[PDB]
From Swiss-Prot:
It comes from Severe acute respiratory syndrome coronavirus 2. Changing residue 164 to L: In strain: Gamma/P.1. Residues 1-167 form the Macro domain. Inhibited in vitro by GRL-0617. The chain holds residues 1025 to 1191 of 7096 of the full protein. It is found in: Host endoplasmic reticulum membrane. It comes from the Viruses. This is Papain-like protease nsp3. It catalyses: Thiol-dependent hydrolysis of ester, thioester, amide, peptide and isopeptide bonds formed by the C-terminal Gly of ubiquitin (a 76-residue protein attached to proteins as an intracellular targeting signal).
Amino acid sequence: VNSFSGYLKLTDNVYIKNADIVEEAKKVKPTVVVNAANVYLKHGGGVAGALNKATNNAMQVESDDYIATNGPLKVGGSCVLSGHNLAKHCLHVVGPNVNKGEDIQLLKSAYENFNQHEVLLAPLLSAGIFGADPIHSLRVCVDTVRTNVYLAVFDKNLYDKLVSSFL
Ligand SMILES: OCC1(Nc2ncnc3[nH]ccc23)CCCC1
């Protein structure tokens, strides 16, 4: 039993809700919140910009030190950093950005990072400003993640479409 509330159950391990991931994180304080990161951990917009803003830019400061030490992530890769005031940990995961020409096949690799964590609050990878089809992202999530994932979909209209079209 955990403290996630109001989610629709999609499968044994995947749950979905129309919610602002920032507000969800502030309420639940999950062990792991997933950020929709880029390889530079530059948290400018989308989910990443919103999460970083909620940390008063502390996420960005930590991220800049991480990159200065380690260099960029790989598309499809991840790193674990602090969750600041939002969660114990933030798993920064890089899905392919279609608006950059990156290979959508890397979306499965990106979701594989979730399997290293027993429970996660997460957005749909490569959706929104990353330019992939969110219906496809949901399918890859369901077919790749085996741990317990609570998906926050910001856009209510998109949420309804994802539920109604889910196979
Ligand atoms: O889930 C993926 C999407 N992005 C967010 N989800 C949840 N909370 C969010 N807060 C800010 C952005 C954001 C991308 C397109 C629609 C939802």
